[PDB]
Design an enzyme around this catalytic site. Sequence first.
Site, PDB file in Angstrom:
ATOM      1  N   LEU A  30       0.851  -1.049  -0.043  1.00 33.83           N
ATOM      2  CA  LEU A  30       0.149   0.142   0.066  1.00 33.83           C
ATOM      3  C   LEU A  30       1.048   1.105  -0.174  1.00 33.83           C
ATOM      4  O   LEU A  30       1.912   1.182   0.613  1.00 33.83           O
ATOM      5  CB  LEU A  30      -0.895  -0.077   1.159  1.00 33.83           C
ATOM      6  CG  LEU A  30      -2.241  -0.901   1.320  1.00 33.83           C
ATOM      7  CD1 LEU A  30      -2.738  -0.630   0.196  1.00 33.83           C
ATOM      8  CD2 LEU A  30      -1.735  -2.278   1.530  1.00 33.83           C
TER       9      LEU A  30
ATOM     10  N   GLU B  69      -9.467   1.440   8.230  1.00 36.27           N
ATOM     11  CA  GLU B  69      -9.865   1.124   6.879  1.00 36.27           C
ATOM     12  C   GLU B  69      -9.707  -0.276   6.691  1.00 36.27           C
ATOM     13  O   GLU B  69     -10.502  -0.812   5.718  1.00 36.27           O
ATOM     14  CB  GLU B  69      -8.863   1.996   6.030  1.00 36.27           C
ATOM     15  CG  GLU B  69      -9.103   2.209   4.527  1.00 36.27           C
ATOM     16  CD  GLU B  69      -9.609   1.221   3.544  1.00 36.27           C
ATOM     17  OE1 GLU B  69      -8.593   0.531   3.269  1.00 36.27           O
ATOM     18  OE2 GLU B  69     -10.719   1.293   2.687  1.00 36.27           O
TER      19      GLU B  69
HETATM   20  N1  LIG Z   1      -5.139   0.141  -2.354  1.00 36.64           N
HETATM   21  C1  LIG Z   1      -6.122  -0.761  -2.571  1.00 36.64           C
HETATM   22  O1  LIG Z   1      -7.040  -1.032  -2.687  1.00 36.64           O
HETATM   23  C2  LIG Z   1      -5.341  -2.209  -3.509  1.00 36.64           C
HETATM   24  C3  LIG Z   1      -3.768  -2.128  -3.520  1.00 36.64           C
HETATM   25  N2  LIG Z   1      -3.314  -3.283  -4.026  1.00 36.64           N
HETATM   26  C4  LIG Z   1      -1.759  -3.035  -4.101  1.00 36.64           C
HETATM   27  O2  LIG Z   1      -1.550  -2.799  -5.593  1.00 36.64           O
HETATM   28  C5  LIG Z   1      -0.770  -3.800  -6.016  1.00 36.64           C
HETATM   29  C6  LIG Z   1      -1.214  -4.955  -6.732  1.00 36.64           C
HETATM   30  O3  LIG Z   1      -1.077  -4.802  -8.299  1.00 36.64           O
HETATM   31  P1  LIG Z   1      -1.428  -5.278  -9.452  1.00 36.64           P
HETATM   32  O4  LIG Z   1      -0.185  -5.074 -10.372  1.00 36.64           O
HETATM   33  O5  LIG Z   1      -2.395  -4.163 -10.341  1.00 36.64           O
HETATM   34  O6  LIG Z   1      -1.815  -6.835  -9.469  1.00 36.64           O
HETATM   35  P2  LIG Z   1      -2.838  -7.956  -9.797  1.00 36.64           P
HETATM   36  O7  LIG Z   1      -2.726  -8.222  -8.329  1.00 36.64           O
HETATM   37  O8  LIG Z   1      -3.937  -7.299 -10.474  1.00 36.64           O
HETATM   38  O9  LIG Z   1      -1.659  -8.982 -10.558  1.00 36.64           O
HETATM   39  C7  LIG Z   1      -1.507  -9.200 -11.875  1.00 36.64           C
HETATM   40  C8  LIG Z   1      -1.427 -10.565 -12.130  1.00 36.64           C
HETATM   41  O10 LIG Z   1      -2.381 -11.135 -11.849  1.00 36.64           O
HETATM   42  C9  LIG Z   1      -2.880 -11.876 -12.942  1.00 36.64           C
HETATM   43  N3  LIG Z   1      -4.067 -11.184 -13.463  1.00 36.64           N
HETATM   44  C10 LIG Z   1      -4.451 -10.016 -13.299  1.00 36.64           C
HETATM   45  N4  LIG Z   1      -5.551  -9.765 -13.975  1.00 36.64           N
HETATM   46  C11 LIG Z   1      -5.785 -10.905 -14.597  1.00 36.64           C
HETATM   47  C12 LIG Z   1      -6.942 -11.444 -15.572  1.00 36.64           C
HETATM   48  N5  LIG Z   1      -7.948 -10.882 -16.023  1.00 36.64           N
HETATM   49  N6  LIG Z   1      -6.977 -12.747 -16.079  1.00 36.64           N
HETATM   50  C13 LIG Z   1      -5.936 -13.412 -15.361  1.00 36.64           C
HETATM   51  N7  LIG Z   1      -5.030 -13.061 -14.644  1.00 36.64           N
HETATM   52  C14 LIG Z   1      -5.040 -11.779 -14.281  1.00 36.64           C
HETATM   53  C15 LIG Z   1      -1.620 -12.176 -13.863  1.00 36.64           C
HETATM   54  O11 LIG Z   1      -0.933 -13.121 -13.371  1.00 36.64           O
HETATM   55  P3  LIG Z   1       0.083 -13.926 -14.290  1.00 36.64           P
HETATM   56  O12 LIG Z   1       1.156 -13.158 -14.735  1.00 36.64           O
HETATM   57  O13 LIG Z   1       0.149 -15.077 -13.269  1.00 36.64           O
HETATM   58  O14 LIG Z   1      -0.905 -14.417 -15.443  1.00 36.64           O
HETATM   59  C16 LIG Z   1      -0.992 -10.736 -13.800  1.00 36.64           C
HETATM   60  O15 LIG Z   1       0.487 -10.722 -13.787  1.00 36.64           O
HETATM   61  C17 LIG Z   1       0.352  -4.069  -4.967  1.00 36.64           C
HETATM   62  O16 LIG Z   1       1.161  -2.789  -4.815  1.00 36.64           O
HETATM   63  C18 LIG Z   1      -0.820  -4.239  -3.624  1.00 36.64           C
HETATM   64  O17 LIG Z   1      -0.274  -4.075  -2.523  1.00 36.64           O
HETATM   65  C19 LIG Z   1      -4.059  -4.446  -4.702  1.00 36.64           C
HETATM   66  C20 LIG Z   1      -5.382  -4.242  -4.613  1.00 36.64           C
HETATM   67  C21 LIG Z   1      -6.183  -3.267  -3.911  1.00 36.64           C
HETATM   68  C1  LIG Z   2      -3.544  -5.119  -0.518  1.00 35.14           C
HETATM   69  N1  LIG Z   2      -5.000  -5.629   0.123  1.00 35.14           N
HETATM   70  C2  LIG Z   2      -6.010  -4.966  -0.796  1.00 35.14           C
HETATM   71  C3  LIG Z   2      -6.533  -3.868   0.087  1.00 35.14           C
HETATM   72  C4  LIG Z   2      -6.165  -3.126   1.198  1.00 35.14           C
HETATM   73  O1  LIG Z   2      -6.833  -2.238   1.643  1.00 35.14           O
HETATM   74  C5  LIG Z   2      -7.826  -2.080   0.915  1.00 35.14           C
HETATM   75  N2  LIG Z   2      -8.955  -1.308   1.042  1.00 35.14           N
HETATM   76  C6  LIG Z   2      -9.737  -1.315   0.272  1.00 35.14           C
HETATM   77  N3  LIG Z   2     -10.670  -0.274   0.630  1.00 35.14           N
HETATM   78  N4  LIG Z   2      -9.808  -2.061  -0.641  1.00 35.14           N
HETATM   79  C7  LIG Z   2      -8.993  -2.888  -0.773  1.00 35.14           C
HETATM   80  N5  LIG Z   2      -9.230  -3.846  -2.120  1.00 35.14           N
HETATM   81  C8  LIG Z   2      -7.787  -2.992  -0.055  1.00 35.14           C
HETATM   82  C9  LIG Z   2      -5.132  -6.270   1.309  1.00 35.14           C
HETATM   83  C10 LIG Z   2      -4.328  -6.663   1.959  1.00 35.14           C
HETATM   84  C11 LIG Z   2      -4.394  -7.128   3.320  1.00 35.14           C
HETATM   85  C12 LIG Z   2      -5.625  -7.485   3.796  1.00 35.14           C
HETATM   86  C13 LIG Z   2      -5.678  -8.326   5.106  1.00 35.14           C
HETATM   87  O2  LIG Z   2      -4.803  -8.580   5.605  1.00 35.14           O
HETATM   88  N6  LIG Z   2      -7.308  -8.471   5.368  1.00 35.14           N
HETATM   89  C14 LIG Z   2      -7.723  -8.884   6.750  1.00 35.14           C
HETATM   90  C15 LIG Z   2      -7.985  -8.042   7.577  1.00 35.14           C
HETATM   91  C16 LIG Z   2      -7.168  -6.937   8.431  1.00 35.14           C
HETATM   92  C17 LIG Z   2      -7.501  -6.129   9.349  1.00 35.14           C
HETATM   93  O3  LIG Z   2      -8.029  -6.397  10.449  1.00 35.14           O
HETATM   94  O4  LIG Z   2      -7.708  -4.947   8.969  1.00 35.14           O
HETATM   95  C18 LIG Z   2      -8.799  -9.461   6.309  1.00 35.14           C
HETATM   96  O5  LIG Z   2      -9.604 -10.428   6.907  1.00 35.14           O
HETATM   97  O6  LIG Z   2      -9.432  -8.921   5.455  1.00 35.14           O
HETATM   98  C19 LIG Z   2      -6.638  -7.232   2.724  1.00 35.14           C
HETATM   99  C20 LIG Z   2      -6.307  -6.734   1.601  1.00 35.14           C
END
Ligand SMILES: NC(=O)C1=CN([C@@H]2O[C@H](COP(=O)(O)OP(=O)(O)OC[C@H]3O[C@@H](n4cnc5c(N)ncnc54)[C@H](OP(=O)(O)O)[C@@H]3O)[C@@H](O)[C@H]2O)C=CC1
Ligand SMILES: CN(Cc1coc2nc(N)nc(N)c12)c1ccc(C(=O)N[C@@H](CCC(=O)O)C(=O)O)cc1
Length: 186
Positions: free
Chosen positions: A22, A30
């Site tokens: 993150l 959050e």
């Molecule tokens: N703030 C937030 O809400 C969130 C933050 N994050 C963070 O963002 C980053 C995660 O990033 P991101 O790069 O976007 O990664 P993804 O988690 O989307 O990983 C992408 C990999 O996943 C697979 N994949 C993704 N989309 C598809 C699809 N449609 N079909 C099949 N395979 C798919 C592929 O794997 P392969 O190469 O094996 O085919 C691709 O290399 C981290 O930095 C994480 O901590 C993540 C989620 C929410």
């Molecule tokens: C990188 N992500 C995605 C993520 C983090 O924050 C977000 N916040 C939102 N609003 N959306 C998301 N998709 C995420 C995640 C990483 C760790 C956990 C995780 O440890 N989750 C525990 C909860 C931990 C807690 O107590 O916070 C669970 O039960 O979901 C979840 C998501």
Amino acid sequence: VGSLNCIVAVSQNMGIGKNGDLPWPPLRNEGRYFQRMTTTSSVEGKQNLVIMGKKTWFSIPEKNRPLKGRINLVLSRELKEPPQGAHFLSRSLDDALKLTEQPELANKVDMVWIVGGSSVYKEAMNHPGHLKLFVTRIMQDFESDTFFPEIDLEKYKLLPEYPGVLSDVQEEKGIKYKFEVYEKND
Ligand SMILES: NC(=O)C1=CN([C@@H]2O[C@H](COP(=O)(O)OP(=O)(O)OC[C@H]3O[C@@H](n4cnc5c(N)ncnc54)[C@H](OP(=O)(O)O)[C@@H]3O)[C@@H](O)[C@H]2O)C=CC1
Ligand SMILES: CN(Cc1coc2nc(N)nc(N)c12)c1ccc(C(=O)N[C@@H](CCC(=O)O)C(=O)O)cc1
């Protein structure tokens, strides 16, 4: 089977992650809200399904893997089997949804939650039909390397309120954020 939803925390600059993590320091309420939203099932004896790309799965602390009380599906076209701890592996977003209608899961699953990669969000986003976006707006800039796709306001409407989701500005570690809900149907 039930509802299809996306959930994300984005910075002012549209950033979602930096170096597998993150872009901001850990925000515990959050996190609690993420957990509460994906985990609560609207129907007895059913569970929610969480869909995530491979890099998102590996960014959850190992001790939290798999996310408890949810069905965990990982998307990847490179993996042969679900990673350790994961329940299902799909090669595409269509297949993960097609699987939902498989007698196996068919009666077990209530809501479906997309918890990321941008890749995953981009696609869910263009998917035909009813979809809701739960967006936590982190109100500052954070150096990021991965971004959330642009929300089209001609297709998504910001809801004025939503049951169980706070309408006021929150604050933690002196970071202000707010929770938003958008709806589409096309
Ligand atoms: N703030 C937030 O809400 C969130 C933050 N994050 C963070 O963002 C980053 C995660 O990033 P991101 O790069 O976007 O990664 P993804 O988690 O989307 O990983 C992408 C990999 O996943 C697979 N994949 C993704 N989309 C598809 C699809 N449609 N079909 C099949 N395979 C798919 C592929 O794997 P392969 O190469 O094996 O085919 C691709 O290399 C981290 O930095 C994480 O901590 C993540 C989620 C929410
Ligand atoms: C990188 N992500 C995605 C993520 C983090 O924050 C977000 N916040 C939102 N609003 N959306 C998301 N998709 C995420 C995640 C990483 C760790 C956990 C995780 O440890 N989750 C525990 C909860 C931990 C807690 O107590 O916070 C669970 O039960 O979901 C979840 C998501």
